[model samples]
Target: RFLKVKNWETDVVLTDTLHLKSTLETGCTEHICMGSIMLPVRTKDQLFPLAKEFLDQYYSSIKRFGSKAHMDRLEEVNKEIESTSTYQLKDTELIYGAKHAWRNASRCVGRIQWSKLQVFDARDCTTAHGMFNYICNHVKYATNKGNLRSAITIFPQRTDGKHDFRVWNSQLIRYAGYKQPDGSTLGDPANVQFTEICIQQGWKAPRGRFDVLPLLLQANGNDPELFQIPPELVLEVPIRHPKFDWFKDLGLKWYGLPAVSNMLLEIGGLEFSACPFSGWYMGTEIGVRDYCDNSRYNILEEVAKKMDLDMRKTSSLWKDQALVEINIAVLYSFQSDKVTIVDHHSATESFIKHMENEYRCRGGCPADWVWIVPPMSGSITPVFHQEMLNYRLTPSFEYQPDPWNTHVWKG
Candidate 1:
């Protein structure tokens, strides 16, 4: 049995595709480590069921606020989504791709601001598995349909002749596969369902040759193009280590390989397993269960060691590799039940005074003091640095609270 190595670049691409770019870009600064949710990979298999479970608990906890207001608002939104206007378009459900010409018209007819609409041209356009060659024409159609705000932008995807990095981030169990007409596992049919599921769940599809994960149709003849159009270019590029014959005996053509040879890893060959000791800490597994099991141990330890040696040999190879930065801060509030408005202001004043005093004591002139109003109150709310605030406030809007009585101010 041969094991497949997980490419680090693939992981990097996925991370970048998701919102991780913000954290990576800002959190690299000193004195901050960004925090985010890391969902369990296994639980993703059950989609709607898990979603229902989460919703049930969430609504139950918030049931106290029921004035039928929330339900009514949701119903209105649902109605809009199902309205005739929404349905009257090609590729309405396909989140990625050109916006239906009518959809763009609706926005323009209403004179709605583009920013508030949250509408976007599907990000899949740039990927290999994105829209067909007619995508640009569709974009033009959208522009004609009242998308004057330029809300439509091309999807940014990579085409390195490998698995769709964006699709992997979506957690589609399979990026590519082979199956019969009825999906009974043909010699090499693409498994498009997983990709469909990802899209339905509001995720972008894979943009690579093997991007589509198979899915059964909800209704016969509803999606005619589903079975008709296939990947424009299908090439099997063996992903393997230099030392192994994992792909040789399989009689498969290798295509679109990484520029550097060391990116590939060997597994399951006679020489690989016969060695006195293989990579114990870090190596691939043939099955899903084995991969899960290996994840539990110090798997990356060996990989890190190997990376140290590889980096020394090919220092120049990594210069162009993707890099990410991150930054974060903690927000402290003194507006709890125990603290009155006066107390909160007093604390704020004290902190500012303390800093000013220290600066004066050190014989340094202090910068002008500035006040900030938070958008939302929470422990994890972002705080702006003084320098950033200075730049931001030069021409930005400012808010002032309504006039208050002296007692209320004192309070």
Candidate 2:
């Protein structure tokens, strides 16, 4: 089923700041919007490091100039650099794969705004509330004017290799419910319109994951599976895709990110009471797509040819104890409208209870377990992380395919 885009309220602020922005003024006033673009990278291996170095250099330049004019100039240069950069240069191969797949398969209702006018490959997403948070929270504008408004283009991969007619539609429509006393819908007096906000799933690379299988084995006093050829331990999820790829169409490529639950648990480790989030997947697991896409499983088998550990013998162990696939679905209900919306709870309680029992078997009895419940509707309920932590128990916040790297910028 195609997902429905929920239109929330949109706010427009008319301010004097827009007129003074140099980034906007130079390109718009001079009509230098269109120009030749060039990028400089060619191989997949070069994408991550190259992009990191470029952003590092760009951020350094931004911090040095400390002027709107300089920043504006940098934006143009970044655009030029991105235009010619190969998909490898941008690292789109890894970042775009899973994002497009999940969005298309799940029918995600979000918008993507792209730009060559500015350099940063950034994205933003909004929850039930109208407040929009940047994916990376890297950009901060002193005034609204110098703030760059980038050009938004849809992914041509979804359409037939064309940018035309493929542009995302943001048309407003109303949802009908109960009628008013006049025999019309509740909003029959006036049609309520909501702004369809765009949300982007991003990825980052060169990230590392603590080989949880090893850790689990150590904790349980058992031998865990090992990656013979060193499978990618996904650390941070990239915030934006680099470029377009045909493989994305066939799910040959996939982006890895830390699950949101893992982040919460890490934070929970510090102080459980501090967590304002809940319910995540648990178990040491790897994304099946990650193994299949990279042929890591096969590669590991080949490596097992010489290694002490038998790859064939470890397949069942890897599938069972080592890989724990689950989802952390956090349910949020806006106080403004009292509307409860569930976001990505993929883990089941059976596994959680099993983990809890495992710890209990070791003399670590958990104080309590929380289940997620509907708002005022009375259903199942998940426990708060803080409450889970109060007993010195570990909450099963599973490894997220998407690293919560975006939140890094939030602080």
Candidate 3:
């Protein structure tokens, strides 16, 4: 007997011996196959149990105080679940799921206010233009004149063997990387491959360090279209040190918002492929990973030379000093510009509080220690001393394959 599996929303008949063996191993009576892997499907019957579990836990919490409509809504959702083969979540369920997904995220250190996430419902958006409009609204609201509130705009979910929408850009705000004649990169090295894809798709590649990339939106079975972001809509912070006058001369700037566009937002058993979320920046994320990483900006040696540090010897700790200064500059610049950003120390403290709260309320928190600890001052943070275990959790945000990988966009 051949089992039909939905792989990336495409129907595939599982007939091979290997496929059968794996399917049996997973004990999956119903499965949603992602790529070649079979993921245990959460049937409509399973939704009632999950919803009950969540509602029980949610109602017990103090957060539900003054929100008496939750139980009524839960009853409504339960009725809907019982009547339909495929369950559709209410707006309240979607918001709660999105918040819980943020809280359960292993990589994010900013889960303290996960409940406060502004969730925009765009489930009706089936076209690229609709996706673009929603995304533009998301950017505008999340940017919030540099105050930077956490927000997510969720698009339609995959259903009935038809693929949902997808956003190609890793983040809504990112610089374009252009390779020059001397074999050097001008913008973000992390985005070089994506930049090439965009250029090949007819996006005019600007030769600059801070050229904002356009949005790439794709509807199921349709070619991805590129939409340029308005320059005035983007909030950018010019990198400058408090004391060093020459730091501003380096001509470095970064987008105030880091709105991740590629991750799939899974709520209950449903997966929204086109949910783009944003969080306020942690200074180390920009300073250590984005700018200081060797493959990215590789600005350590340059900063070291400018600081008049002895870089010839590794013992001189030139890289360390430069990294500290870079982080300092990032925090200083953002603060000076009235942009919302957190320092590594403060961010870790918030994470510790989040952990304590989650522990008292949920028994245990699933966290990735590597991600919980900041890059610059790993040993110094409280998260470094604490033990953490990473595990799979439902209703979570997961990274998906790039649009270019799944589709042939260019001739």
Q: Which candidate has the top score in lDDT?
A: 3
| Model 3: per-residue Cα lDDT over 1-411, one tens digit each | 332222222232222121221101222235542222323224665667666655654554536733667778677767776676446677877888898888777667888888889999998787898888898899899989989899999988766424658888999989998777799988999988889889988998767889999998987646889999888899999999988888888788888998889998877567788889998999999999988999999998788888999989999989999999888999999999999999989998888778666655665456666567788778877777766544455568887777677775443
TM-score of each: 0.20, 0.17, 0.82
What would the per-residue lDDT of candidate 2 be over residues 1-411, giving only the tens digit for each residue?
111111122221111221121111111125443212111003324333444433343344346444665465445535543664322223332233222212111111111211121222221211211111121111121111222222111111111111111101111111112223574332111211111111111212111221111100000111111111112322112111123222123222111222121112111111110111111112112222232123232222322232234345655443322111111101111111222222322232333343344333432222222222111212232222212211221212112221122112221
- Model 1 over residues 1-411: C-alpha lDDT tens digits? 211212232231101111111110222236643322111011222322322332232334347234464455444434543452111112322121122211212101111121232234343343322333323333233223221223322223212212211212111112443333673532213334444444554544445434434322111111212221223322223222333333223222221111110011111000000000001000111111111122221212233343343444446432111010000000011111111112222333343343333233422111222222121121122212221101110101111111111012111
Residue 120's C-alpha lDDT in candidate 1?
A: 41
lDDT of each: 0.23, 0.22, 0.78
Q: What's the candidate order when arranged by decreasing lDDT?
A: 3, 1, 2
Best by TM-score: 3
**Candidates 1 and 3, the one with greater lDDT:** 3
RMSD of each: 25.6, 27.0, 10.5
Error of 3 at 120 (Å): 0.5
TM-score of 1: 0.20
Ten-residue segment with the worst summed lDDT in candidate 2?
213-222
Candidate 3 Cα lDDT to native? 0.78
For lDDT, candidate 1 versus 2, the one ahead is 1
